[PDB]
Amino acid sequence: GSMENFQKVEKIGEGTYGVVYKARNKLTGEVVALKKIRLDTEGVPSTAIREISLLKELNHPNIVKLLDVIHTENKLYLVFEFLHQDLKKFMDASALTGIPLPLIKSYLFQLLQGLAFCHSHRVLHRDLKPQNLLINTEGAIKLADFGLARAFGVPVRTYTHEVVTLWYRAPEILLGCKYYSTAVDIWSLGCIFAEMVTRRALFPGDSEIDQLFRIFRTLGTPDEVVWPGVTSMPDYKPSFPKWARQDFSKVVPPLDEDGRSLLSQMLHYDPNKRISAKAALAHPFFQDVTKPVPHLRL
Amino acid sequence: SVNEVPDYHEDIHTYLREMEVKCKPKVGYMKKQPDITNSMRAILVDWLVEVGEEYKLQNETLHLAVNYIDRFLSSMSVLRGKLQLVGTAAMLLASKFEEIYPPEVAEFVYITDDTYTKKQVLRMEHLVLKVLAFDLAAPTINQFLTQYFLHQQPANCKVESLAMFLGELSLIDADPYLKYLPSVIAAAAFHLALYTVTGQSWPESLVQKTGYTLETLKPCLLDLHQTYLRAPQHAQQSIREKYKNSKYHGVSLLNPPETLNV
Numbered sequence: 001g002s003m004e005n006f007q008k009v010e011k012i013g014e015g016t017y018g019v020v021y022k023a024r025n026k027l028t029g030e031v032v033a034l035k036k037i038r039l040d041t042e043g044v045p046s047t048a049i050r051e052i053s054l055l056k057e058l059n060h061p062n063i064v065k066l067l068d069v070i071h072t073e074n075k076l077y078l079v080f081e082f083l084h085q086d087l088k089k090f091m092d093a094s095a096l097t098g099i100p101l102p103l104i105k106s107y108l109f110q111l112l113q114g115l116a117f118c119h120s121h122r123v124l125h126r127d128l129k130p131q132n133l134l135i136n137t138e139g140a141i142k143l144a145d146f147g148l149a150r151a152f153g154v155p156v157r158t159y160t161h162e163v164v165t166l167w168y169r170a171p172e173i174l175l176g177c178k179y180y181s182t183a184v185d186i187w188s189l190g191c192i193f194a195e196m197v198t199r200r201a202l203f204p205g206d207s208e209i210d211q212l213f214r215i216f217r218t219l220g221t222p223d224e225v226v227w228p229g230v231t232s233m234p235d236y237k238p239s240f241p242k243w244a245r246q247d248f249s250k251v252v253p254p255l256d257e258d259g260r261s262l263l264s265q266m267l268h269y270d271p272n273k274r275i276s277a278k279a280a281l282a283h284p285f286f287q288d289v290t291k292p293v294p295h296l297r298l
Numbered sequence: 299s300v301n302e303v304p305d306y307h308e309d310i311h312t313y314l315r316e317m318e319v320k321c322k323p324k325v326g327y328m329k330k331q332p333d334i335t336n337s338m339r340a341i342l343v344d345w346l347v348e349v350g351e352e353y354k355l356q357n358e359t360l361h362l363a364v365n366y367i368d369r370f371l372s373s374m375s376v377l378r379g380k381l382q383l384v385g386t387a388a389m390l391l392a393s394k395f396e397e398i399y400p401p402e403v404a405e406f407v408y409i410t411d412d413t414y415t416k417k418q419v420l421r422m423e424h425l426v427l428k429v430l431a432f433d434l435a436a437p438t439i440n441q442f443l444t445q446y447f448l449h450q451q452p453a454n455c456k457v458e459s460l461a462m463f464l465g466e467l468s469l470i471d472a473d474p475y476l477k478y479l480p481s482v483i484a485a486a487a488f489h490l491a492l493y494t495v496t497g498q499s500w501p502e503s504l505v506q507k508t509g510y511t512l513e514t515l516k517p518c519l520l521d522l523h524q525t526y527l528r529a530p531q532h533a534q535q536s537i538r539e540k541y542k543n544s545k546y547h548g549v550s551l552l553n554p555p556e557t558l559n560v
C-alpha cells in the first residue's frame with residue numbers, strides 16, 4: 001500500500017530521522033514501527049537514501065526488517081517490524097539483579113550474527129549503541145537505525161570522519177586515521193558487551209580527548225609494539241600520558257575467563273588484529289549459548 | 299589489512315556478483331527509446347564526467363549515476379529535452395549516496411545552465427527513486443577493479459589509473475558496453491591496463507577469484523581494445539582530458555598497444 005491501512009498507536013521514539021510511531025495494520029493485525037521522515041529543501045536526505053537501499057538488501061533475523069516504504073510528495077514512511085524495547089531500557093530495568101549470563105551471551109551472539117551479515121554485504125553500521133539495539137518478547141535482539149550506515153568498497157576509501165556516538169567510538173576514528181573499516185563496529189560491540197555485564201558505559205567520555213584518555217587508562221596507552229603505526233597517526237600526540245594496561249579481570253570483574261578473552265579481542269587497539277564478527281561466533285565463550293526470553297516483561 | 303577486509307572480501311565479491319545481475323540495465327533499451335540515441339546518451343555521460351571534475355566527486359559517484367540513468371531509461375521513455383534532467387537527478391542521488399559532502403541541489407540546478415528549475419530536479423529525484431524502488435547500492439566497475447588491484451605483484455599506480463580510465467571510457471558507449479557486466483568490464487580493463495604498462499596478463503589468482511579467463515573475457519577485451527585505440531578520435535573527450543591529470547598519473551597519454559596477442 002499504504003497508510004490508510006495503518007492505525008497509529010503512539011510515539012515510541014525520535015531522533016534524526018525522523019519520528020518513530022507504533023502502529024497496527026488494520027487488515028492483518030500486524031504491529032509495526034513507522035519511521036516518519038519529513039521532506040522539505042534539499043529533497044530526500046542521504047540518511048534515508050542510504051537506510052532504505054541498504055535495509056532493502058539486508059534480510060537477517062538479527063537485523064531490523066523493513067516491510068515497506070510509503071513515499072508521497074511531502075512524507076516518507078519506513079514501515080518496520082515492531083520490537084518492544086531497546087537494550088538501554090532493558091539494562092535500566094535490570095538493575096539490582098542484572099541481566100542473566102545466558103541472556104547476555106545470547107544477545108552478543110545474535111549481535112555478532114547480525115553484524116557479520118552486514119559486513120559480508122559490504123555494510124558498515126557506524127552507530128552501534130544500546131539505543132539502536134532492539135529486543136522482543138521471544139529472545140531476539142536486532143540491529144536498527146541504518147541512517148548512519150554506509151556501503152563500502154574493498155579496500156576501503158576515506159569515509160565521513162564523524163562518526164559513531166562518542167562512548168562507542170573506536171580509537172582509530174578518534175586518532176584521525178585516513179581509513180577505518182569493519183573493526184569500528186566490533187569496537188562498539190565490545191563496549192556494549194562490557195555494558196551488558198556492568199549496566200554502565202565502559203568509556204563515558206565527554207569529549208574526544210577525554211574519550212581517548214579513558215580508553216588509555218583502561219587498556220594502557222598504545223605504543224608501536226601493541227599498535228604498529230599509532231605514533232604516526234594524525235591526531236596522536238607524543239605528549240599523551242603513558243598509562244599502564246590494567247589487569248583485564250579488573251576491567252569487568254564479574255566476567256569469566258572466556259568472556260574476558262573475547263572482550264579483549266574485541267577491544268584490541270590494532271584494527272588489523274581486532275577479532276571479526278565472523279571469527280567471534282566460534283569463540284569458546286559461546287560453547288553453551290541458548291536463546292532464552294527476556295527475564296522481565298517488556 | 300582490515301582495510302582490505304580479509305574475513306569478508308570473498309563474501310562481498312560473491313554478493314556483488316549476484317547484485318550486478320539484478321542491477322543490470324536492459325541491453326536493448328535504446329532501440330525502444332523513440333526520441334534519444336546512443337549518441338545523445340554519450341553526450342550526457344561526457345557532461346557528467348565534467349560535472350564530477352568540477353565538484354571533485356568520486357569516480358564511484360559517476361559510475362553509480364550512469365547505472366541509475368541506464369536502469370531508469372530501461373523502463374521510462376524520455377524526450378531529448380528532458381534527458382539532462384534525468385542525468386542531473388541521477389548525479390544528485392549518486393552524490394547523496396556516495397559522497398561525504400554532496401553538492402547542494404542549488405549547485406545541481408546551476409550546472410544545467412538553468413535549463414531546469416529546482417522544483418523539476420527535486421521532482422525528478424523522487425521519480426528516479428520510485429522507478430528504481432530506492433535500490434541504489436549498485437555494483438560498479440570500480441568496486442570490482444579495486445578488488446582486482448589487490449592481485450598485483452607488486453602494486454602499480456599506472457596500471458590502476460589506466461584500468462580506471464578504460465572502465466570509465468566504457469560508460470560513454472552503450473553500444474557495445476551495455477551488454478557486459480561491471481565485473482567483466484573491470485576484468486578486461488585490468489588485463490588491458492596490466493598488459494599496456496607491464497606486458498603482463500590476467501593472473502591465475504584472478505581466475506581463481508572470478509572464474510573468468512582470457513577466453514571468456516575476449517569479446518569485451520576486443521571491444522575495449524578498439525575503444526582504447528579510437529579514444530583520441532571519439533567525439534566525447536572529457537575522460538581523456540581528466541586522465542591527463544597527475545591525480546591519475548597522466549595515463550590517457552600512454553599509448554595503446556597495437557595488438558593483444560591473445
Ligand SMILES: CCCOc1ccnc2[nH]cc(-c3ccnc(N)n3)c12
Binds near residue numbers: 131
Ligand atoms: C530506535 C528508536 C526506536 O524505534 C523502534 C522501536 C521499536 N521497534 C522498531 N522497529 C524498527 C524501529 C526503527 C527505528 C529507527 N530506525 C530503524 N531502522 N528502525 C523501531
Ligand SMILES: [Mg+2]
Binds near residue numbers: 328330331332333334
Ligand atoms: Mg532510440
